[PDB]
């Protein structure tokens, strides 16, 4: 009876079994879920308005979308998994459901398919760019969650440094891979950076004041505005520390937030780089490129 | 001041800002708290000992040394606070007191950073090998925390599969790295994964017998045997559901494993496997290489 | 001294004592309890509707409703306890009050004091139902905690194997125990099993639709038609198994169950259950019987329309 | 598909199905568990030492025996539940391993089963002495379980009759199930009686002094005594009431028992009851029996002195 | 090195050092943290409604109500901190935060900061009401203490006499210091007593029916009306041993309250007290003193109709 | 029904009750466990060493003895509720029994008793020293805990006024309360108070030669000495904040002191402290009192 069995195991051992689709299915689970929620899909947008300047083939622009998306639902399966959040497109997290050993090994899993999804286009390039986005993504999400933990509030340089290694990456990360099989190289790069922030910097006001980061301690641009320019009081730290669910918090937070008039700071910041980025997009169509006007309603749709 | 601030975003848009030592010295606590601790070190003999046929230069001995180990580290990390436990080479593990988050990214981070040192080489044969391998490792943990979550009871040959996956992967991979700069050009991975199978085997053997699989709800080869060897007593998988920590349960889940004669099947399933391992070496050494002592150590150091 | 004490033990040796009201008072606390709170009483009806076929005197219809409530008010007893349930009737439980083991000792005394109850008909047949109910009885409770402890999804016979021993024996042991004393004597079996299975597939639809089986972990007939029908998706085991109490989690539970179409099933099963109920109630009439107008209605009361 | 299904199911209302080992072997898991470990199985023999007496054959012993090993087994395992126990004859409790649920449903079910096996002598005498038997087990668990939680010191007289109840029935039911068969009429019930209240005494005695009852807050014979000697003391009642498992306390309380003189009394009071239980076994020979060594090896087994 | 530090010793034994402020303030932390949270301050309406009758000056009240103050605030940390409390006037408890040790300490050092106080009136009569006083508040406490934790319901009498124990001496106490200078010798205890007896049955009630008395298991007034009324029923005692923090249990114990009727009952009494006041107060005024307002509103203010 | 309840609770505000024994004995319980105990009752051998001066009647003398007996008993079972200890007198603390509630209520209402006790003498001074010396032990034992517990490490001098603080003042209660009625009239408080910090200081030198010191976390004399100096390794501090009961925690520990050489310290600390002590009932010998030889024997008894 012994033989028999370590017969089989050496026999496997020379020839390796073949991976089946059942345990694919498996350990693809929560990525399944969190991919079937319905979404706002702003980065498919973001790709087809640079293929008006690119004009690059179809199937090149399938695969990125494709990697884009493996990345984008990995990071936020993580990111969920991180801060301790409870809701995400107003449905259960997929941690609530599945554990979070399942969660995170189904996002590493993915990390590691989307590399092997890049090699398919036979150039070192694009891994160079795909290991350089993965560290800045990284980098990011230590610096977020360590600000977070420590309870130490960040300055500004330091915070908008932080937003460009965990947001601005994977758009970064999308034009550069789409600019390997087209004729256009220009530099594209500052656009994209300016975009990123504004993308950011607009998703911490409309999240507040058309408030789950004060359940979850979360340090935005306007609390740390509030934070920094009135050292006077220590009410704001204390409730961030809190994590309440009270609304008594809540509207205690929001009438602090108003009285030291953040908002319309974050306006002027906006509108002062909203100007810049419309200037930056006018200075690249003078170089030999055709008007967009994908990009400007992308610019215009969002606003404060 | 809002336009001395505006000027210094775009400004580090334009041109991006360089990472830092006090930053990256934060990013990898966890990797070092548990780098400082010395351990067994058996992969370091491992290529230390296959060098002998291989005969390679020093500095990329290093560089792979370098690259297991913090792959290994990394793993420990992960599978540590996926699996709930509490000590890690006789000191508290690091998740209880950085945190999780922090650990989960320093893996993460380690992970990339191995990437990184790899492109160093400049051969695409590398970045094949670092993926597959990276791959198998997920998929091995995956199967290992669904077993384990949903509890059904693995046969022999999925769980070597599994084993194969999670264990074996390292052993291949820091192989198949020194082959690329040796002038011998032969096949050496099944005695690899055979090597590895045996080393996972002895593990789970000695954990119990010289219990915290017990504890936590393992699947190990002795626990499998005892469960499937009579299949209408359900004793033991009930106690590895309750997930105890009292001593009587212990003693009584060893007693009923010795009941059922366990610990004398995997005694002869190493024999058997050294012996077959034994003569794959003998093979090898007939086409041209020589006797290697290191190799005949570490295997017969091993033996149950 | 000593010698007193010993003296009233061998007495009490020789003589034992006789049983009190105040002891009795307490050992029956949850028991009066759980009573004490109003309830459906669906038994009551199911016993006088079978009442017009067979016409026994007053007597004996008192003495077997009171055994079957008894029964009944144990067995709830028993069942709230092993499922961790924390209300029932609105009600705290009674175990959130006196404990577990006064819980406990209740139940398993008003069965033994049911069993008494029945040993005054003078009848040997009496006992014989008496006993194989309380087995099948048993047997159900332990196959269901089984499952729902050890996480094997069963499949639906089996599922109903277990319903018929859980639920239908009360109602097979309610009907014998007329049929002492009745001139007619034909089979009743068939359609109290089948109207047992149909009470158990109404209640378990309209816990969760009109949803604590999510909370404790229950297997349910759509939660098994739902975790059959797609086998490669792992989310309603996974939802059971955490044990959630959280209403976004029931929330996503239930539109899984109507993404895969469970409720239409039940439905639709339910709808030939109810046919071929009416078929045999027909043709039991056409034997010699009259029309039932009260089976009639406890029938048509539970259509899932 | 679902036409199948429901043909299925009717089907299976008109010819129900058979019972599987399969399903047994599963429902009667904690019991094999606990029937495994050896145990000194005291009742084995005084089964044997009245044998001398009634001269009964000997398949009726073996199924007497069989009856009293499953009660008493199954009153075992729902004791260790109810007194939140940690350890049985050296090894982990029940419920430690397969739960509460499983392990209750379990002692239920050997209990229905024990008296299916009686029903096969073709006697109603049996059922009744099992059913009286069983309504004072649970008298007796009842109250010890009420008295434990409510912490109030019973008297003397009071845990006696408990003691009675809980002990003495299964010794009751043994020795009369013999004598459906045996051609000796007399009177045995007062000696069996008294010999129950010497086992439960000597193993309160024994379990302290050769300490889990004080782990336990349990009220046995010594501590009643100790408690009640001195009402204006409530340190042993604190200790009870703390319920801690530390080495110090035991020791403590062990101390002031000593103070008090209890395990003297104990000893006394066995004496003058072994005295009367000889008396009475010497009364019985002079009716027309002969010589029992066996029951006198018994009695002189369970000596304090 | 060892002769100076030994020349310091010795400087320090023959001149003992002076005590100073950034340790005063350190000892005095969770007095000064209940002290700042605001409060009904009633004593102060208390004592402000007798100095009508006896005209003292202001520096002697001044002085007679900071003991009293310190003394009521001491009381609530103590009993705080033993009655396993998690909220004081709507704030968390002050031995969450700066532990338990040091509200101990705190509120004993308080308690003899206002002894060395009362000193400086220069009468050995303000020391004796001082030291009594004291003695009966701790007894109070001691016996409600006791009570609770070896789970007896005391009868009507004994609690009226522990509510008098352990609420009325500080009432009696402050009345009697401020007649030391005063020039109106009448007595007034009676008085006091009935006021202080009036404000616990009113805080009783007013706790629950306007409910952590049912999650601390403390026995009230009306609950031990409704454990007393019907003996045979073991619900109330139950959920008081419980210790439960659902709002369930806590539901059903009023309702379980309501239906025994006993909130009438303490509204009857209440009512019946204050007339009972009222004519006390009628009767002292016919002596020679003039019409008092304030203690007619404070005793109009306490009426539970 | 209500009128009998109403007509009884009026009698009784009208004439109040009478206390009873039998609420006495369950008030007065968890300290009647404690004073069955048998002690080394040295303060009845230093009192009885004063009265060979002051040759004061026996009436006094017995009430002095139980008034301090009364409360060195309340303050040892406040002291064991305070510091979280597990035996005394090798035999179970009083509060593992009662619990905290009854055996403080019980150390607060002897403490009053005692107090009661003291009126009888019919003299203000009395009812000065009595306020006084509790109020000193009360700023003792709160300064001491609160150095326990916030982990700050006072120095020498400080300690040692704490340690006459709540030590000292029971020794100097006694002598005082038993001058009232003698002749002799000159100063004995400095040799009270020099004798007070010896005994302290040699108790606690015999503690760690005679342990749960340092798994409670006290800091004793050469505790102290020894972080002062080697103002540096925080080994004893962090030592002294595990709490940990192990033989090893403790076995370092030890050694850790004895690096130090603490006992020389102490040593000599005690020998001077002696010194000065036998001088200084050399100088009071002078102004006409009798050879005493109770007190030498009773300083030779304890020392070093």
Same mark, same amino acid.
């Given at each position: 009876?012994?033989?028999?069995?370590?017969?089989?195991?050496?026999?496997?051992?020379?020839?390796?079994?073949?991976?089946?689709?059942?345990?694919?299915?498996?350990?693809?689970?929560?990525?399944?879920?969190?991919?079937?929620?319905?979404?706002?899909?702003?980065?498919?947008?973001? %790709? *087809?308005?640079?293929?008006?300047?690119?004009?690059?083939?179809? /199937?090149? !622009?399938?695969? @990125?979308?494709?990697?884009?998306?493996?990345?984008?639902?990995?990071?936020?399966?993580?990111?969920?998994?991180?801060?301790?959040?409870?809701?995400?497109?107003?449905?259960?997290?997929?941690?609530?459901?599945?554990?979070?050993?399942?969660?995170?090994?189904?996002?590493?899993?993915?990390?590691?398919?989307?590399?092997?999804?890049?090699?398919?286009?036979?150039?070192?390039?694009?891994?160079?760019?795909?290991?350089?986005?993965?560290?800045?993504?990284?980098?990011?999400?230590?610096?977020?969650?360590?600000?977070?933990?420590?309870?130490?509030?960040?300055?500004?340089?330091?915070?908008?440094?932080?937003?460009?290694?965990?947001?601005?990456?994977?758009?970064?990360?999308? %034009? *550069?891979?789409?600019?390997?099989?087209?004729?256009?190289?220009? /530099?594209? !790069?500052?656009? @994209?950076?300016?975009?990123?922030?504004?993308?950011?910097?607009?998703?911490?006001?409309?999240?507040?004041?058309?408030?789950?980061?004060?359940?979850?301690?979360?340090?935005?641009?306007?609390?740390?505005?509030?934070?920094?320019?009135?050292?006077?009081?220590?009410?704001?730290?204390?409730?961030?520390?809190?994590?309440?669910?009270?609304?008594?918090?809540?509207?205690?937070?929001?009438?602090?937030?108003?009285?030291?008039?953040?908002?319309?700071?974050?306006?002027?910041?906006?509108?002062?780089?909203?100007?810049?980025?419309?200037?930056?997009?006018?200075?690249?169509?003078?170089?030999?490129?055709?008007?967009?006007?994908?990009?400007?309603?992308?610019?215009?749709?969002?606003?404060?």
């Amino acid at each position: 009876a012994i033989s028999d069995h370590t017969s089989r195991a050496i026999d496997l051992c020379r020839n390796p079994p073949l991976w089946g689709t059942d345990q694919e299915q498996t350990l693809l689970g929560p990525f399944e879920y969190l991919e079937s929620i319905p979404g706002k899909n702003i980065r498919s947008q973001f %790709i *087809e308005a640079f293929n008006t300047w690119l004009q690059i083939p179809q /199937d090149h !622009l399938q695969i @990125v979308g494709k990697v884009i998306s493996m990345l984008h639902t990995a990071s936020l399966l993580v990111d969920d998994i991180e801060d301790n959040s409870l809701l995400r497109r107003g449905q259960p997290v997929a941690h609530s459901i599945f554990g979070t050993a399942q969660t995170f090994n189904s996002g590493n899993y993915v990390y590691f398919l989307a590399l092997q999804e890049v090699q398919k286009l036979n150039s070192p390039r694009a891994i160079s760019i795909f290991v350089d986005a993965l560290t800045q993504l990284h980098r990011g999400q230590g610096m977020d969650v360590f600000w977070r933990d420590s309870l130490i509030c960040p300055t500004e340089e330091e915070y908008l440094d932080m937003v460009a290694n965990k947001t601005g990456a994977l758009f970064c990360l999308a %034009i *550069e891979l789409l600019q390997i099989k087209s004729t256009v190289q220009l /530099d594209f !790069l500052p656009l @994209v950076r300016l975009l990123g922030i504004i993308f950011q910097i607009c998703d911490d006001y409309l999240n507040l004041k058309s408030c789950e980061d004060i359940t979850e301690g979360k340090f935005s641009f306007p609390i740390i505005h509030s934070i920094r320019t009135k050292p006077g009081n220590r009410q704001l730290i204390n409730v961030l520390r809190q994590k309440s669910k009270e609304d008594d918090v809540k509207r205690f937070a929001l009438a602090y937030m108003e009285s030291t008039q953040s908002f319309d700071y974050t306006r002027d910041f906006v509108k002062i780089l909203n100007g810049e980025a419309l200037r930056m997009i006018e200075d690249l169509e003078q170089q030999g490129l055709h008007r967009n006007i994908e990009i400007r309603n992308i610019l215009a749709r969002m606003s404060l």
